[PDB]
Scaffold this active site. Structure first.
Site, PDB file in Angstrom:
ATOM      1  CD  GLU A  60      -3.090  -0.695   0.048  1.00  0.00           C
ATOM      2  OE1 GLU A  60      -2.975   0.353  -0.631  1.00  0.00           O
ATOM      3  OE2 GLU A  60      -3.957  -1.662  -0.193  1.00  0.00           O
ATOM      4  CG  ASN A  90      -8.606   6.150  -4.346  1.00  0.00           C
ATOM      5  OD1 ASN A  90      -7.429   6.369  -4.048  1.00  0.00           O
ATOM      6  ND2 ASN A  90      -9.216   5.064  -3.901  1.00  0.00           N
ATOM      7  CG  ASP A 142     -13.950   7.450  -5.007  1.00  0.00           C
ATOM      8  OD1 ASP A 142     -12.858   8.054  -4.767  1.00  0.00           O
ATOM      9  OD2 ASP A 142     -14.549   6.708  -4.218  1.00  0.00           O
ATOM     10  CB  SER A 155     -12.002   9.071  -1.873  1.00  0.00           C
ATOM     11  OG  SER A 155     -11.535   7.942  -2.541  1.00  0.00           O
ATOM     12  CG  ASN A 212     -10.944   5.877   0.147  1.00  0.00           C
ATOM     13  OD1 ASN A 212     -10.226   6.177  -0.810  1.00  0.00           O
ATOM     14  ND2 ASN A 212     -12.212   6.200   0.211  1.00  0.00           N
ATOM     15  CG  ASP A 269     -17.328  -2.172   7.122  1.00  0.00           C
ATOM     16  OD1 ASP A 269     -17.999  -1.539   7.967  1.00  0.00           O
ATOM     17  OD2 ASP A 269     -17.581  -2.195   5.884  1.00  0.00           O
ATOM     18  CG  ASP A 282      -6.480   5.172  -0.966  1.00  0.00           C
ATOM     19  OD1 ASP A 282      -7.634   5.210  -0.543  1.00  0.00           O
ATOM     20  OD2 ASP A 282      -6.138   4.543  -1.978  1.00  0.00           O
TER      21      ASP A 282
END
Length: 129
Positions: A35, A46, A48, A50, A59, A101, A52
């Site tokens: 990562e 990202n 969208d 967003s 995110n 989650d 990270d």
């Protein structure tokens, strides 16, 4: 901060990630390697809108507030900048929520694509833990 491999292993273990939600320490070290390259300051935008953040690339849509991710949540109740600290406490606390989650470590696409199903114990080889 750019962590050494064994340095990060030791910190992640101290913070309770070894076997957290059944994922051995090597899975967490491997995830961080792919990562962030062990760099707490890593950031990546990202598609969208967003971003990270930090050693586990957490995110801004769901998990942290960066002030520029419209209609996002902040389920870890932190500013995303907290995830860039040399102190990994905030990243670990948030990672624990994320891996709880429902999809486990599949939430990290570097883990699913580069760590899952591999010899992840290699990532803690040589470390005095």
């Amino acid at each position: 901060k750019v962590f050494g491999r064994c340095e990060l292993a030791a910190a992640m273990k101290r913070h309770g990630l070894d076997n957290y939600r059944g994922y051995s320490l090597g899975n967490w070290v491997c995830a961080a390697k792919f990562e962030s390259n062990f760099n707490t300051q890593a950031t990546n935008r990202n598609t969208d809108g967003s971003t990270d953040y930090g050693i586990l690339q957490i995110n801004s849509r769901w998990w942290c507030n960066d002030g520029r991710t419209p209609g996002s949540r902040n389920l870890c109740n932190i500013p995303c900048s907290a995830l860039l600290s040399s102190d990994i406490t905030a990243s670990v606390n948030c990672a624990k929520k994320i891996v709880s989650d429902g999809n486990g470590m599949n939430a990290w696409v570097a883990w699913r694509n580069r760590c899952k199903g591999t010899d992840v114990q290699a990532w803690i080889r040589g470390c005095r833990l």
